RNA sequence: GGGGACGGGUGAAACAGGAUGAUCCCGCCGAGACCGCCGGCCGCGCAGGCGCCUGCCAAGACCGCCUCUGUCAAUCAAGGGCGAAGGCCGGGGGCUAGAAGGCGAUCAGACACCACCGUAUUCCCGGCCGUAAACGGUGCCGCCCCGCGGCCGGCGCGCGCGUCCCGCCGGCCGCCCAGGGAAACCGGGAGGCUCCGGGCUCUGGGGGGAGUAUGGCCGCAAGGCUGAAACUUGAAGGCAUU
């Protein structure tokens, strides 16, 4: 409902007993119905397969990466987003992953990820265009819309509040240690402005 | 038998003695700490004077000989040694010091980024 | 019938930039693509990322407004080369 | 001068003054006409039928040994190419560049050669249609060219 | 470059003139 | 030099010994600071790399040797001696310029060479074309077919010579100059060619715990 | 009038040449029009060569030569006397003189 | 070379030899031994691929994959429909690219 | 990590950088461009243009020919495609230079040149734009035309025989006898033209006003393409010589 990326229902033999266990996997682009998704430390490098991050050759786009081994997925889960294998340190058994924001994170080589990039790529390219098109987007997610500006509100309702000329009245930049009701605006801004 | 890196370029000349790996420096001094005129830091006189002070240090550190690595500013510019290079090399020979090997160590580009000055050049 | 082919629905509304962008994306969303599996031009979109062949009957994960995407085409190609190596 | 290039070259073939059959050659008109007919069974094009007669057999000039050219022999037997070979060979080239263009959309140079080759197919077709060596209905389009080959 | 500088001057007059016609439509 | 005797006062010199292949194994003395903090002297000298002319390594014919320079890196500081192993081979910058002359065509190949010891090496190989003995045309330019025949010859020969080679024998092949010579024979048959040699040989990948190999190379004169 | 048939450049059967920069000026100059004098010199001056040669403890090592192709822009070349303005009569001479 | 021959061999077969396009006719022909060569495609559905390769082993009739696509194979046999499996039930002219 | 006082920058400088230890040296590492020297009276491309290494794909000119066809041709409004750089649009990317911006020195004043920092840009993908001293300032196809060279790609001849030699065809070129031209010069044409007529298109008609006005068409824009007049004026210009 709220995800902008497809999910996938994959059936696995019950290793504990006799049935078939079904799991919900963010779909990497290219997963097709009837595909064989292998998982494990002897898995081959194909889209959809889950391999430990150390086992994955470098430069491979990966999705649903675990930050700490055995976490069943934490990073690279949104539409189109991916992480990249950068370096394996075989002396520390750690790997550097390029996070979707471009930050680089050392993670244990025993963490697991799915080969491929999350499907749903290019979703935000389309303009929402209408306010209704956006009402539908957020009804599926949370009560976060429509968004009213504090400047429109009254002094009691918001810190930006209300004067005779709708102004912020003080710098938007607010300290990192501003208390609950005051941390409104740009927070701990290292810089501001277009550049 | 250390390695002498003389970087001779317009603006200043640096004579540095380090040992083979180059990880440790056995003494470094540059022309420009020997002259008060900014124009004369690249000059041969300052470089001769500079090497004489360096010669004292490497003759007190057991550095009997050096292998020279004269380099220009190089990179995507220069590629021709400044006046300081020959002067320092001569001083190294004048104050003892055998020169075991001489090499061109200037950074050179196999293909390059644009040097400054525009397509019309430095119009001075 | 002229410049605004599929964006005539919007009418004189939303501005030219939105309509021009929509014309590229909406044409791609409504297009028929070739099934990798059955090689027939009957893949159409059911939802963003979900594309189903109307002949092959196979559902494949894909780009929101295209069966395949430029980043993903690069990834399959890198994976094959790297897989051939290992 | 080349029709579609600013190139000048002369690499022609010089037919002999003698239009009469050579002495060493021992092939009767029927003997070589039989070879032409069996070569049509292999499907070999008349340019190749003429070459095969020239090198494996010694008949360097067919019209000298026989009284007619290869296609006149074929037309008399009603075994001539339905689409004249020159147009057909251009059509193979147009589809071959078009196939490459399907994989690569950024070969602007390849696209240019297609316009020139296609322009010849149109020019030769109008002559072939006027001469009636081609049915007047015939049209070279492009998208439908794959079927026409 | 007086010819290149004349063209630029002509252009900055034609754009002004095109703006003035647009005010009156 | 400073042990017998302000920063230099607290220092020591730990001699560097080259691989057994080189006739002058002793090469230099490396300055290190006396142990302080968590900075033991041995840890600092453990991975330093020294560039040594093959002339200094084997003292003899400078003309036939001094142009190549070997990079040797400390892998163990044992008994006060910084034992060293191959980190690369290269011809001097003066050799590189001398080889190029206008009027000639240059063939330059690079190959990834795999060793039994687990090192991936890169051979940078340079070749040049020269005038025939009785040639009217002044410029030594070869038609494209010969250049590709030549490119294949170096690639094929390098697989034959350095394909199954291990680091211990490679260092001796690179210092006896046989590989340069086999490449010249292969290219000779195809066309008169000059200066066919390896410009550089660098380690793309070095194996860990290469210490048993280091014993074979730095020591083990028998092997 | 047209001063030179060459047009100051050696471009023949081409429409574009790779740009190079003056070593001194830094002006972009098409490869054909650059002055391009190659120089092979010695790492140290002859006046220092004698003393360096005596200093070396190696058996037979000569001062190693430095090879550089200097490419100059027209203005850089005439100012630094790499090339001279000649008469219409001698402008045709092509052989390297002196 | 091998590709040039592959295109040439199937064009000569279309004009000279007999052949059948399609899976059902192919399963019927291999089983009776009336197939001399069978050419599959890259996108042959996987079960059909295995069945055709087992019954081909059982009849010892050569099965080769085409360089690609039922669509691309179909345009090669000269037709405007996709051909997954084509069977050379007799070659009048040329059968050289049946290599292994 | 080392070591220690300045480093940059220049015509000389100065603003920046440096005991938060810079510069310098080495050991590494990231990212993005870029393809050196070879590299040219080399080559290829329809022009614009084209240079890492491998693999793949389709083409192209030249040449050789006793192969095929049998004029299927030449140039061309209208019409289609392409088209350096800069620019624009929607994304990616962001190293280097760097329009704008800011700045230190100048100088009467420089806001300019020079130094420094730097945004768009540069680079990629999908579209636009349709311009350049887009040049050989030289349309295209065809003919004869004087020697002496060089290079380039085929082909053939000689000879014991070598990247030899002589030719042939095609391309790039130098010098040039006539010939031409107002000369400069061109002579693989700008020759074979007042002795003026092989064919086809384009354009000009003293200098400006003015590539402006206006209408049109086109472009997202910038602008492109088309395109005057009133009016003013005795020269403007070419190439030579003191």
From TrEMBL, chain C:
InterPro entries, sorted: Ribosomal_eL37/eL43 (IPR011331), Ribosomal_eL43 (IPR002674), Ribosomal_protein_eL43 (IPR050522), Ribosomal_zn-bd (IPR011332)
Disulfide linkage: 35-38, 35-53, 35-56, 38-53, 38-56, 53-56
Keyword Ribonucleoprotein: yes
A molecular-function term among this protein's GO annotations: structural constituent of ribosome
Cellular-component GO terms for this entry: cytosolic ribosome; ribonucleoprotein complex
Entries under PANTHER family matching the protein: 60S RIBOSOMAL PROTEIN L37A, LARGE RIBOSOMAL SUBUNIT PROTEIN EL43
Protein name from the UniProt record: Ribosomal protein L37a
TrEMBL record, chain E:
Secretion signal span: none
GO MF entries: structural constituent of ribosome
Keyword Transport in annotation: no
Keywords in alphabetical order: Ribonucleoprotein, Ribosomal protein
Gene Ontology terms: cellular component: ribonucleoprotein complex; ribosome
This protein's record includes keyword Ribonucleoprotein: yes
Example of a GO biological process term: translation
Ranges in a coiled coil: none
Domain of life: Eukaryota
Family: Belongs to the eukaryotic ribosomal protein eS32 family.
Quaternary structure and partners: Component of the large ribosomal subunit.
Protein name listed in UniProt: 60S ribosomal protein L41
Organism: Giardia intestinalis
Organism ancestry: Eukaryota, Metamonada, Diplomonadida, Hexamitidae, Giardiinae
Full-sequence portion shown in this chain: 17 to 41 of 41
From TrEMBL, chain F:
InterPro entries associated with the record: Ribosomal_eS1, Ribosomal_eS1_euk
Complex and partners: Component of the small ribosomal subunit. Mature ribosomes consist of a small (40S) and a large (60S) subunit. The 40S subunit contains about 33 different proteins and 1 molecule of RNA (18S). The 60S subunit contains about 49 different proteins and 3 molecules of RNA (25S, 5.8S and 5S).
Native species: Giardia intestinalis (strain ATCC 50803 / WB clone C6) (Giardia lamblia)
Biological processes, Gene Ontology terms: translation
Name of the protein this chain belongs to: Small ribosomal subunit protein eS1
Localization annotation: Cytoplasm
Similarity annotation: Belongs to the eukaryotic ribosomal protein eS1 family.
PANTHER family cross-referenced by the UniProt entry: 40S RIBOSOMAL PROTEIN S3A (PTHR11830)
Pfam families hit by this protein: Ribosomal_S3Ae
A GO term for molecular function: structural constituent of ribosome
Superkingdom, taxonomy of origin: Eukaryota
GO cellular component: cytosol; cytosolic small ribosomal subunit
HAMAP family: Ribosomal_eS1_euk
Keyword vocabulary terms for this entry: Cytoplasm, Ribonucleoprotein, Ribosomal protein
UniProtKB/TrEMBL annotation, chain G:
Domain of life where this protein originates: Eukaryota
Keyword Iron-sulfur attached: no
Signal peptide: none
GO cellular component: cytosolic small ribosomal subunit
Disulfide bonds: 22-25, 22-76, 25-73, 25-76, 73-76
UniProt: Zn(2+) 1 binding residues: 22
InterPro entries attached to this UniProt entry: Ribosomal_eS26, Ribosomal_eS26_sf
Molecular function terms, GO-annotated: mRNA binding; structural constituent of ribosome
Binding site for Zn(2+) 2: 22, 24
A family per Pfam: Ribosomal_S26e
Assigned keywords, A-Z: Metal-binding, Ribonucleoprotein, Ribosomal protein, Zinc
GO BP term, example: translation
Protein family (similarity comment): Belongs to the eukaryotic ribosomal protein eS26 family.
Protein name: 40S ribosomal protein S26
Upper classification of the organism: Eukaryota, Metamonada, Diplomonadida, Hexamitidae, Giardiinae
